Amino acid sequence: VQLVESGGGLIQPGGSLRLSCAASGFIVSRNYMIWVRQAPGKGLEWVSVIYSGGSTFYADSVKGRFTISRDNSKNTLYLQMNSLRAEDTAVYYCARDLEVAGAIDYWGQGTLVTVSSASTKGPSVFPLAPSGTAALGCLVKDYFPEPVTVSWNSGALTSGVHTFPAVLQSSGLYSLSSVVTVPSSSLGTQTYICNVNHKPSNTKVDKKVEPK
Amino acid sequence: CPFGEVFNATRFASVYAWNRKRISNCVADYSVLYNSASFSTFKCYGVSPTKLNDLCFTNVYADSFVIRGDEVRQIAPGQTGKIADYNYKLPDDFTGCVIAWNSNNLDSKVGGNYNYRYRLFRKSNLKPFERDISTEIYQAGSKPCNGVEGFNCYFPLQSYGFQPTNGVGYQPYRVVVLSFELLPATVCG
Amino acid sequence: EIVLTQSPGTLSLSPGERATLSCRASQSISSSYLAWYQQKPGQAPRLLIYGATSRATGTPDRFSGSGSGTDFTLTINRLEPEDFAVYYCQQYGSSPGYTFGQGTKLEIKRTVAAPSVFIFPPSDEQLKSGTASVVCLLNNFYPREAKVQWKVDNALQSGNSQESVTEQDSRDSTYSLGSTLTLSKADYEKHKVYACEVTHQGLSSPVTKSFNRGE
Ligand SMILES: *[C@@H]1O[C@H](CO)[C@@H](O)[C@H](O)[C@H]1NC(C)=O
């Protein structure tokens, strides 16, 4: 028994996507089947339900845009999403529901949908230069889509490194910082290079961080 | 016509096993019904509660059962939900009335009253005025159930839990559905 | 519209203590229609309790549920390390038919640790491009609650900064936070003193780090 989801990706405002949920063990057409979504960093939100007898119900925020359905032959559940807005960005779970006989007891792994209207763009890398323990870092600014990977000295330096979660700026581009603390006596003797890699844009930067 | 023997019974049926009483060869009069103050719901479809007493029908049926407050809106034409789909289905051209009143004083009990049950699982929607009372184990997965409850193998009937403190949407409501049938009239007001 | 308000927003305990999470409904509901879920970072929710009190398949006995009406409770007896997670409550009886609470984070307790505060001016490379980003760093503190106040020529700045926080560190259980103040190059060169002032439980008084543009 398992629920496997697919079809997520990056789409523009006003565009359309279709999520699919191949079931195994469960028979989709005999169950209450739901979609629930989670926007990045936020709570769970119920999207839609299809009853084994064919009845369908929808959250207010998606009524008229989203359409749940199924194919008994493929044993799969679908979610057709039209007129997508930025706020529809989320991880989408299909899940089986048992109501008072068991609540939502099985959930698929989730599929990510991003609604953006931003174009692929490699990051700008700027040093955060140090002025007991010193701190130094890299500002990896104005990239899209996610993710960037950041390492220090090609992976030779891991102790003390904090790579912060990316934040979505008002421009629709992401930005994140990577910092590391070191002995301030190492500032004169050891070289600190942050290694930024953004696969969607095939950008690889190596920025050396020196005291100003 | 013995309306009181329907509205004033001591216990009601569970919705999945709703009760049907035939009413025939008697005088109707819907005055003590409509002009009662104790009815939370009294909606008519296809007729008119005003000019109800001065008409005739070949036969009338009174179906009675108990449901949750929030489900009374499903006892109407063209409704969907667990009750309309798997328990009691009104037809789309319904000609009759739906009467509902809160029975929290009668059907709630401190500690929970679980005597009233509804069908939660069913492969297909009921047809109008279908009564399904099977208690066959419901196969949600791929392996046969062989009449044994287990994972993916559920008893299709589930209890309401009626406690006096629940909010009114969770409180029990006694419903009576009056269906008028003009197929030689024998029920007039 | 039915609303589930979970509390507290964050619970900090050490392994083997007793965890009590509450859920309060904006209206009275039957206990049959309430469930509790655990969710670990990166994963799908995991059902723990349904019908207020019934243990899902695979839910160990240290998890117990209770309550009725407006108030419901999840109890973890003898916390285990794998129990630090987000916990959600859910109702499935009232319109629209599925509602979740906002979440309670159950996090590891440790001793108070004041942050080390660092301030970074924009680099010349960035300024050349026409934007200045001033970064303030708070390192290895506990607990998570910290106020970072940006001050430009002693004018408190609101609405042009964004904060970002690491997950609790797996070795010392502390937090780290970056706050970024974004200006245009023109507005950045209009002022002299840039300061971030940090307030935290572990600091006897707010600590300020600052720099003067071009120094
Ligand atoms: C049910 O009993 C009450 C008792 O006062 C009575 O007034 C009412 O008319 C009865 N319902 C009928 C006759 O339909």
Reported as half-sphere exposure (CB side, CA atoms, 13 A), residue C168 has a value of 19
What domains, with CATH codes, occur in chain A?
A: 2-115 (2.60.40.10), 124-209 (2.60.40.10)
How many Å apart are CA C28 and CA C93, to the nearest integer?
11
The answer on B184 and B145 residing in a single domain is no
**In angstroms, rounded to a whole number, what is the distance separating the alpha carbons of residues A74 and A147?**
33
Residues B148 and B180 in one domain: no
Residues 6+ apart with CB under 8 A from B145: B137, B138, B139, B152, B153
CB contact under 8 Å between B141 and A25, yes or no, is yes
CB contact under 8 A, B151 and C95: no
Is the domain of B4 the same as that of B50? yes
**Whether B94 and B8 share a structural domain:** yes
| Residue A61 sits at the chain C interface (C-beta within 8 Å) | no
Q: Burial code of A123-147, b = ≥16 C-beta within 10 A, e = fewer? A: bbbbbbbbeeebbbbbbbbbbbbee
Taking the Cβ of residue A103 and every Cβ of chain B, the question of whether any pair is shorter than 8 Å is answered with: no
Angle at alpha carbon of residue C159, lines to C156 and C163, rounded to 5°? 95
C194 with C134: CB under 8 angstroms? yes
Burial class (CB in 10 A: 0-12, 13-18, 19+), B99: buried
> Tokens 């998890």 — which residue?
C63
Q: How far apart are CA B94 and CA B171, in angstroms?
A: 26
* Ligand 1 neighbourhood includes B32 CB (under 6 angstroms): yes
Give the 3-state secondary structure of residue A99: helix
Query: Do residues B14 and B86 both lie within one domain?
Result: yes
Q: Which residues of C touch B154 (CB under 8 A)?
A: none
Q: List the structure tokens of C130.
A: 């026409």
Task: State CA C65 to chain mean position distance.
Answer: 24
CATH number at residue C168: 2.60.40.10
Ligand 1 pocket test: which of B32, B36, B60, B64 has the largest number of ligand atoms within 8 Å of its C-beta? B32
Does B77 sit behind a cis peptide bond, omega within 30 degrees of 0 on the bond before it?
Answer: no
Q: Which among C70, C74, C68, C61 is positioned nearest to C22, based on CA atoms?
A: C74
Return the SS3 of B92. coil
Q: Are residues B31 and B90 in the same domain?
A: yes
Residue of C nearest to B168 (CA): C28
Contact (CB, 8 A) for C6 and C21: yes
Domain of B130, in residue numbers = 112-163
Q: Are residues C169 and C92 in the same domain?
A: no
If asked whether residues C10 and C103 sit together in one domain, one would say: yes
Nearest CA in chain A to B156: A101
Taking the Cβ of residue B78 and every Cβ of chain C, the question of whether any pair is shorter than 8 Å is answered with no
- State the total domains in chain B: 2
Residue C110: count of CB within 10 angstroms of its CB: 14
Does residue B38 sit in helix, strand or coil? coil
Q: Helix, strand or coil for residue B139?
A: strand
Residue type, B7: F
Same domain, B177 and B122: no
The reply to whether residue C100 touches residue A44, judged by beta carbons under 8 angstroms, is yes
Q: Is the dihedral of CA C27, C33, C38, C42 positive or negative?
A: negative
Q: What share of chain A is helix, strand, coil (3-state, %, to 5)?
A: 10, 50, 40
Strand ranges for A25-89 from DSSP E: 32-38, 44-50, 56-58, 66-71, 76-81
The domain in which residue C127 lies consists of 116-212
Residues in B closer than 8 angstroms to C68, CB to CB, are 163, 165
Give ∠ CA A41-A42-A47 in degrees, rounded to 5.
130
Q: What is the rounded CA–CA span in Å between residue C142 and residue C109?
A: 9
Tokens standing for residue B175: 């419903």
**Which residue, among B102, B97, B104, has the nearest Cα to B61 in the 3D structure?**
B97
Tell me the residue type at B95.
T
C215 interfaces chain A, CB cutoff of 8 Å: no
Of C32, C57, C123, the CB nearest to A126: C123
Kindly state the tokens that stand for A43: 């709570």
**Encoding tokens for residue C91?**
């109702």
- Give the SS3 label for residue A153: helix
Count of domains for chain C: 2
| Domain C-terminal end among C108, C134, C153 | C108
Distance of CA B154 to the CA centre of its chain: 24
Of C88, C108, C128, the one marking the end of a domain is: C108
One domain, residues B41 and B123: no
Distance from residue B7's CA to the centre of ligand 1 (Å): 8
- The Cα–Cα gap between B23 and B187 comes to 8
Considering the domain architecture, whether residues B85 and B146 belong to the same structural domain is answered as: no
Nearest CA of chain C to the CA of B98: how many Å? 22
Contact B23, B2 (CB under 8 A): yes
One domain, residues B68 and B154: no
Atom in ligand 1 nearest the alpha carbon of residue B6: 14
Do residues B23 and B89 both lie within one domain? yes
Tell whether C95 and C15 lie within a shared domain.
yes
Q: Are strands A111-115 and A10-11 parallel, antiparallel or unpaired?
A: parallel
CA distance A173 to A155: 26
Distances (CA, A) of A196 to A44, C25, C87: 32, 47, 35
How many residues does this entry show for chain B?
Answer: 189
Mutate which of B1, B5, B8, B106 for ligand 1 pocket (most atoms within 8 A of beta carbon): B8
